[PDB]
Write a protein that binds this ligand. Structure first.
Ligand SMILES: Nc1nc2c(ncn2[C@@H]2O[C@H](COP(=O)(O)OP(=O)(O)O)[C@@H](O)[C@H]2O)c(=O)[nH]1
Ligand SMILES: Nc1nc2c(ncn2[C@@H]2O[C@H](COP(=O)(O)OP(=O)(O)O)[C@@H](O)[C@H]2O)c(=O)[nH]1
Ligand SMILES: Nc1nc2c(ncn2[C@@H]2O[C@H](COP(=O)(O)OP(=O)(O)O)[C@@H](O)[C@H]2O)c(=O)[nH]1
Ligand SMILES: Nc1nc2c(ncn2[C@@H]2O[C@H](COP(=O)(O)OP(=O)(O)O)[C@@H](O)[C@H]2O)c(=O)[nH]1
Ligand SMILES: Nc1nc2c(ncn2[C@@H]2O[C@H](COP(=O)(O)OP(=O)(O)O)[C@@H](O)[C@H]2O)c(=O)[nH]1
Ligand SMILES: [Mg+2]
Ligand SMILES: [Mg+2]
Ligand SMILES: [Mg+2]
Ligand SMILES: [Mg+2]
Ligand SMILES: [Mg+2]
Lengths: 168, 8, 168, 168, 168, 168, 8
């Protein structure tokens, strides 16, 4: 039974936790402890295919969980998340991509660039910049709002689709 | 707002 | 005799203090203690109407003053200030607006978006972005420089005009 | 019959005693012991309202009367008096205002700035300076002469009006 | 530089004090002790002539001031003041004129009839009556308001002009 | 590393201590014993030049400390401080300047005129008076507030710049 | 009561 191991990475407070909880529990969490790293499973149907999603919501803590190590190693796809109203979070993306390429020791890791908080009127990262970055990396770019659930299924499902291609 | 501070 | 209670809010060091002092004392203060919250009065003539301005210069303490609570409650108009060379301060605006709407429990609170430090050549927030944000909010956007006094009377007077409309 | 508790404060010799005696007893006192603190009552009609004025004439001696303590505490309004021919007494006003705000632990204490001795040709404090100070504080400024009774009823009555607003 | 000695006479409360203070100090006095007699000097330019005005504000004290005696004697011109809303004060005028003629022992004393309080809507002495009286005496009649400064310079300056004619 | 010896002089309670402590310790002292004379050092960067400031905070005790004597003699620059709400302190400045010229036996002593307590509403020394005095002396005039840190770095740094010119 | 009121 196909499990997809997804790892959600990005600057603190970009909404990695909010996105994951939205996907899993169908609600929007205003306050999710910035340090808590947790894993979540959900059975979903994507393009008629039932699969298990096994998602690590990283909090970038240092302190060693055996599960987290296994996850970076055996993580099949990575959501690289920034917030569209947080320029720093966007600048950080390259760092996250670099890290993932090093862990996997590969140029071709299934990955989706995610611009979260797209509900906000205070946008500082234009879509074109994000699209240019995604294009340079040859990965999808998806705009999400954890608050309004916009593109939430899309972000995760797109990563699965990226993994499916890669495996095949 | 101040009057929960942040109280859920 | 009309008093207007104005509340100046925004990220630290955007120039809330410098703007207020400019209006009140007609000089530019390069160093005004970031933590000091104070109130100021001035009698001014706006469109031939003499009014008293009663201005709270916020300095976002997390220290509970009964006066500050009363002020947010009884503040009639809010200057939401960012610095045009400070992207973070612009990102923060949305937060301030939200807070004010929640305090006042109203979608129609007189408010002016103020882009301060217009004198600087190092602009990172373009005017059109600020205008778009103000438009979305349906409030005036004014460019100010506390250093040169550009638009200073304008910012405060515009808020008064917003209040006048609201009351009438 | 509503009682108003008024407290007359200011530098020694500015005419706190002369003003209070003028109001109460309708004569100008050449010599009133600088140390003598006392309270006085008078029935007046203010805006058709009959009220009792209960006035503490402060003298700031270093002997502390329980009446004066009660008065600072339970004083509803403060005449802050300077002499228009005494610059130091004007400088001191700020100090008195500070003290009152601390006693009352309130930024909104009914108060009137009083420039006494307006009969004298030797003016050193111009009216605009006094008006600007009152304006900055958002309180009335009244010019009085204890000698010629100019503005005497006015000073006290204005304070009552300030109190009336505050209460209501 | 010519000094002009002016003496202001008239029934109590007609505004002799308020008029003189207006001229001298450029403000309107709410309360001027009815009994206080004082003298005031001011340097003025009247028709391009700089002159010193030396004004006695009479208060109808019987009680002997050496200054007042000397003033009636050496007073060069007399403002005879009534209030336009006070018939008695008008009736008294004739008395004042008589007294002045006897003091000066002359029927040709520079004099101006002054109808004060011209700001009031409650007029009881019509202008025509006052004009008739002034005409019978062959002196100017001037309407003044000490409150609004109406005709104030005019009244005093006209008396100076009367004195100038007399001396010529 | 160049040491600059600065000497802060002025009437008691003008804020020599409050200014010096603000510069050195970055806080405003409510109560600093008026008689306590102390010396303070701080390393600063002024115009890219790192220097030691060696500041004597004079307390004008008529009591002779060997430190203070050495300091008057070896003091390179003098802050002449008044309070903008203290006329007497301004009147004294001339006296201080005279004394400094006599100690140095020189007409060319680096000096800055400092108007302190600019945060006070009770201003009795207008800026133009202070500017005229500074101009007559050919020295900088800086307005300071020890409370809000306004112009504090400015006052001290300006004196250093004055010294730098003098030496070089 | 009044200003907290029903609110918290
Ligand atoms: N408008 C909007 N707000 C979001 C979104 N995602 C998260 N938030 C808000 O910002 C925070 C994001 O969640 P958080 O768990 O702290 O971020 P993480 O550490 O990156 O997982 C929460 O306080 C939410 O209130 C989004 O997609 N849109
Ligand atoms: N270039 C520029 N700088 C400014 C302006 N206004 C204020 N500043 C500087 O910003 C700093 C802080 O001002 P302040 O009002 O205390 O910060 P606030 O609490 O964010 O209002 C001071 O160093 C000022 O000199 C302006 O209009 N233009
Ligand atoms: N011109 C004038 N003189 C006054 C007035 N009030 C008091 N004086 C004089 O100022 C002196 C000090 O008066 P006092 O009432 O003791 O001052 P206090 O200590 O402030 O109460 C007295 O000798 C009075 O003659 C006033 O309103 N106008
Ligand atoms: N309405 C009005 N009141 C005036 C005028 N001149 C004086 N008064 C007032 O008359 C009242 C008492 O009379 P006052 O002027 O003191 O008369 P005096 O004591 O005889 O000089 C005061 O309230 C004065 O302010 C005027 O032109 N119009
Ligand atoms: N409010 C205000 N107070 C000041 C300022 N500068 C000095 N002070 C005051 O100065 C008083 C004593 O001054 P101090 O520094 O000991 O002066 P020195 O003894 O003459 O060197 C204190 O009570 C402070 O309140 C200022 O800029 N604003
Ligand atoms: Mg988190
Ligand atoms: Mg501030
Ligand atoms: Mg007294
Ligand atoms: Mg009179
Ligand atoms: Mg000291």
């Amino acid at each position: 039974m196909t499990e997809y191991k997804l790892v959600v990475v990005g600057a603190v407070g970009v909404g990695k936790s909010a996105l994951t909880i939205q996907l899993i529990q169908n609600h929007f969490v205003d306050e999710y402890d910035p340090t808590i790293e947790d894993s979540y499973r959900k059975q979903v149907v994507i393009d008629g295919e039932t699969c298990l999603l096994d998602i690590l919501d990283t909090a970038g803590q240092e302190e060693y969980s055996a599960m987290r190590d296994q996850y970076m190693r055996t993580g099949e796809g990575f959501l690289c998340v920034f917030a569209i109203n947080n320029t720093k979070s966007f600048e950080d993306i390259h760092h996250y991509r670099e890290q993932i390429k090093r862990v996997k020791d590969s140029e071709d890791v299934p990955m989706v660039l995610v611009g979260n908080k797209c509900d906000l009127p205070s946008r500082t990262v234009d879509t074109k910049q994000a699209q240019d970055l995604a294009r340079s990396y040859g990965i999808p770019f998806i705009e999400t709002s954890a608050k309004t659930r916009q593109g939430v299924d899309d972000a995760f499902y797109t990563l699965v689709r990226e993994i499916r291609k890669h495996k095949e | 707002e101040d009057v929960v501070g942040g109280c859920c």
